[PDB]
Each structure stands twice: as structure tokens, then as C-alpha cells.
Amino acid sequence: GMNNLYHLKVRCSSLHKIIGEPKSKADKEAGKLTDTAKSAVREMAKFDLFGYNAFEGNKYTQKGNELEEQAIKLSGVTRGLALKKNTERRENEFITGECDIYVPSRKLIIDTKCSWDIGSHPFFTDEAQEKAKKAGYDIQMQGYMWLWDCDQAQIDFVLFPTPLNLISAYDSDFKLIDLVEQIPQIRRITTVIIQRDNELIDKIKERVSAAQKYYDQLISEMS
Template identity: 50%
Template sequence: MKLFRCSSLHKLMGDAQSIAQELRTEEIEALIKKRKRTDAESEMIEQLKVQSLSDTAKSEIRTIVKEDLTTFKSFKGNQYTAKGNALEDIAIDLSGKVRFKQYVKHQGRWENNLITGECDILDSNNDLIIDTKCTWDIGTHPFFQDEAQEKAKKAGYDWQMQGYMWLYGCQAAEVDFWLFPCPVELTSDWDDRNQLIDLVDKIDLRERLTTVRYVRDESMIQKIKDKIPHAQAYYEKLYQERIKAKVA
């Protein structure tokens, strides 16, 4: 079965607006039409909604199927991701130093029968996972805690970290947002190098880190367990549809 990456979980976990057609039996159709339901009936309806995929989830799965069947990639990276990749080792090293530890990048993708993921830092002694994110400039860096929490949630790091904690058996996960001067080779002639490099350098390094912490949430992990089998089934349906449609 298809294993979904932790980084895509936030696109898969949204609640559907209605119960999926394949889950609608005559009994369920009758329940949907009822104006007054018992607590048990209402719980059944909610569980069926959890099992149903949202439009966003279906769209994401279609994209994944296209990528798996071809060499097409919906996202090949940009200057922002290039900066993060270039400075990842520095970010990991500094994330260790601020915690009085020596960290190196974790190697090896972990998986179970539903999801797969590879975190940046695995601190097994403290049941802790850390992911580092290098922001582009002062404007995009979350200097404030509420800003960092909003940025992390918008990017789906809340679901990603829950997936990691489930895979690695950890109790906490932290996202370190680091702001570093941009490597000059990643800038273009129309970029303002003063803003991307010089202004950043003027800020104390200790002020250029904002951390968002997550604790293991069994209810979110249970939702992953409930939802992903249906994502796998939809993926398999689409995959087989294209395989059967191939011209010999």
C-alpha cells in the first residue's frame, strides 16, 4: 500500500464536508435525512465524515499518483528551499549548541504501514524530534511566538510533527525557525542583498531563532490512523485506473 509522507499529512487530514459516496448505504442515507438523531447515530455520522476524504485530500492524492506514474514533479524547489538546503547543516549544528548538545542530521527514513518520514534531528535520550527551517529574510522570519505558531500551522508542521512522533515513538517535537544571511550565490541581480545579508548580520544570532513546540497528541495520531487507510484506498483506485488505461 502507498505510504504517505508526514509532510503531506496536513493536506490529507481535513474533514470532508459530507460523507463519501462509497460509504453511503441505505441505512446511512436514512440517518443523514433524519432531523433528530440519537447520540450514537450522531457519533456514527461523525465517524463516517472522518473516514471521508476532503476535496483538498483528493487533489493531493491525484498529484501524488501523477508523480508516481511519471517523472513529473509538481514542485521542484525555488530560491527559498535552496537556501534551506544550503544552510541545513549549520541550522542543525546551532540547534544543538543552543541546547548544549551536539546534533548531526538524522539519517534514515522511518515508516509503518500508513506513513513515512525522516526528521532532521532525533534526540532519543530526550524523546525529542527537532526540525529546522531556514527563513528567507527578516520579513518572512517569525520573530514573535504567535507568528511562529501561525506560520508552522499554515505550513502543516503540526500534523507533520505528530506523524514523526508516532513513527519515532517520541513525546515532543520542536520546529526551529532560523534566520541566516542568504548565501550570495543564491541571490540574483534584482535581489536587495543589503536586506538579505547585511541587515540580517546586524541582528544577534540568538535573536534569530524562534521555536514552536508540540507535544504528542494521541487524538491527532488516531485521526491519522483512521484517515490514511481511506487515502490509501483512493490512491490505489486512481493508480489502477491509469494502469488499466495505458495503451499497450
């Protein structure tokens, strides 16, 4: 009963953690979760039950927060559009999300990803595509397109110099600032276009639904 006050909605940014499918196609269709997915759902259960946050956040994520405004401005000038940070979190019965930029005029979501350094930044188009696949940003965009009724998403990978306050004793000013400022700004944005894929949105639904059932079972053990 207490456990009807616990209910899982998966953040769009965490959907890649639970989206994976069993290698067995019959188990995929039966809605069995992968070991990775279960491990992620346990972290979500332990956060909601105990307040323990597995991923605190660090200099990488703090850089994106500090440069968020600058990223959105670059997204805008690259497209000749006056863009603003979206400030609403939406949700449906499965997921919740707060996108960076919503452009209703083009049925378009834009998301800015502020790379840490030249090494991690995907300058090259194959590199950007893979990074979006490996990091799960493709699935994240499908979640935003679902919540915002959009037809496309564009992930703007952007490299700015690292703000001084985030460069630790062991980090390099030369690498994280000087070398970056030498590169023309137009070469430091790489965009990956993701088309809405309703079969993928249906997959998000199936996987999240299986995750919520597993989550409920976890909650019941602690009740």
C-alpha cells in the same frame, strides 16, 4: 494486478495536504476526503504513474539544504547538546519520514526551518505558532513522533543570511544578507514546542487510510 505494485505512503512533510476534514462531521467519520486532499492524492498518483513532480524545489528549499548543517549546530548550542543530522528514513504502513534531529535521551524530535527573509521568518511567538499551523508542521511533527516513538517535537525556525548563490537578479543583498547580519543570532531562532497527541496520530491514520483507498482507485483507472 499491476496496480498491486502501486502503494501510497504519505511523507510526513505532505501530511498537512491530506489531513483536512470535511466540514460535515458525519462525512469526517465516514472517511470522506476533502477536495484539497483529493487534489494532493492525484499529484501523488501522477508522480508514481508518470514521474511528474508537481513541486520541483526552488531558492527557498535550496537555502534550507545549504544551511542544514549550520541550522543543526544552532539547534545544538541553543540547548547545550551535541546534535547530528539524522540520516534514516523510517516508515510504517501509512507514512514515511526523515527527521532532522532525533534526541532519544529526551524522547525529542527537533526540526529546523530555515526562513528565507526577515519578512517570512516568524520572530514573534504568536507568528511562529500560526506559521507552524498554517504550514502543517505541527502535523509533520506528529508523524515524526509516531515514527520515532517520541513525546515531544520542537520546531526551530531559524533566520540566517541568504547564501549569495541563491540571490537572484531581482533579490536584495541588502535585505537578504546585510539586515540579517545586524540582528543578534539569539533573536533569529524561534522555537515552537509540539506535544505528542495520540488522537492526532489516530487522525493521521484515518486520513492516510482514506487517501490510500482513493489513490488505489486512481491507479486502477490508469490500468
